[PDB]
Amino acid sequence: SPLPKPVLDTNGKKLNPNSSYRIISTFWGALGGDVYLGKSPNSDAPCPDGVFRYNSDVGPSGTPVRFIPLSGANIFEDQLLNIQFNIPTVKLCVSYTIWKVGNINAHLRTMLLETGGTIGQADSSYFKIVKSSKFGYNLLYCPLTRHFLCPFCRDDNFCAKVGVVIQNGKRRLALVNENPLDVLFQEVHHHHH
Amino acid sequence: LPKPVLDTNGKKLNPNSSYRIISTFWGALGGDVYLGKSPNSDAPCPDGVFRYNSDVGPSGTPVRFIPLSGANIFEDQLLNIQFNIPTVKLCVSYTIWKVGNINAHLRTMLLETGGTIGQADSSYFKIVKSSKFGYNLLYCPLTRHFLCPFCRDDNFCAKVGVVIQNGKRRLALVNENPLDVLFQEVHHHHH
């Protein structure tokens, strides 16, 4: 009966797949800090492959992303999509703009958000944007493994909340069971270039 | 004849292209140039030019080069430098490289953003061949030229290097220990 709800940016405008957004926190000062593309020191990837957020807002602004809906050209709450850092790269690092979820990390006891994924394929990592119970939105990761293996055997609509774990003194985005990261979407675009 | 500046693929630098400014070192001494902020900065936007403390970590912030005159980027010719990134409207000037005032704690001028392009108050840089592999950036103040055009050595340019500020590598004027850099072309691959 109800039609879906568009996700809005910080200016109140509907999210557009043709636009670029920073994923920013609802925090300030030492607790603020936008999402960015980084690398853990013990990664064996050839390119930065880690989704982090800065340790405070006193530093760089975040890495811009675009949102690629699984189907259609709108971006609604509770809609599967891929997330990709929308940045110029070298040719061999293109896949390391595309968000994915890594394997279970033994030490931190969860899966970390990484890049190196695909877009729009059965092996792609799909996320959803949902309204937070406080300000802004949460990201959810929705594995489609059972779905693609048996398209509708039975439907377990399982998604996991995206939060932060501290890794080598840095805020690493990761799957959490409680306290998801509250985020807003800040549109950015080029002026001149 | 003017000599084109080359990127790491051997192609002439193009004002229509974007480049990361990367180190000639590998590992702990590596680390690309990026747009950051120091504490104690009252700026409304990130306003500091840094480079990463190693090359394990993020990649650098892309820049474009804007010649003061003409359509080509040559060695030893004045240009402005600008981080070539999307921003909010408030922070557009804070993509444009400038050189700040003397920093009392470090007794040199630090590289900042917040500048202008193509004007008499813009910060002009030159790219020159390093005595080692790669290139150096020089800052060429117009101060003496405007204040005393027939004084000596008004074309003095200071080499850009790095000073440590709050545990970070901050680009700054360091005339006798320049940062050797290379230019790594990057572009979008939307499909």
Automatic annotation (TrEMBL), chain A:
<keyword id="KW-0722">Serine protease inhibitor</keyword>
<protein>
    <submittedName>
        <fullName>KTI-A protein</fullName>
    </submittedName>
</protein>
<dbReference type="Pfam" id="PF00197">
    <property type="entry name" value="Kunitz_legume"/>
</dbReference>
<comment type="similarity">
    <text>Belongs to the protease inhibitor I3 (leguminous Kunitz-type inhibitor) family.</text>
</comment>
<keyword id="KW-1015">Disulfide bond</keyword>
<dbReference type="GO" id="GO:0004867">
    <property type="term" value="F:serine-type endopeptidase inhibitor activity"/>
</dbReference>
<dbReference type="InterPro" id="IPR002160">
    <property type="entry name" value="Prot_inh_Kunz-lg"/>
</dbReference>
<dbReference type="InterPro" id="IPR011065">
    <property type="entry name" value="Kunitz_inhibitor_STI-like_sf"/>
</dbReference>
<keyword id="KW-0646">Protease inhibitor</keyword>
<keyword id="KW-0732">Signal</keyword>
TrEMBL record, chain B:
<protein>
    <submittedName>
        <fullName>KTI-A protein</fullName>
    </submittedName>
</protein>
<keyword id="KW-0732">Signal</keyword>
<comment type="similarity">
    <text>Belongs to the protease inhibitor I3 (leguminous Kunitz-type inhibitor) family.</text>
</comment>
<keyword id="KW-0722">Serine protease inhibitor</keyword>
<dbReference type="GO" id="GO:0004867">
    <property type="term" value="F:serine-type endopeptidase inhibitor activity"/>
</dbReference>
<keyword id="KW-1015">Disulfide bond</keyword>
<keyword id="KW-0646">Protease inhibitor</keyword>
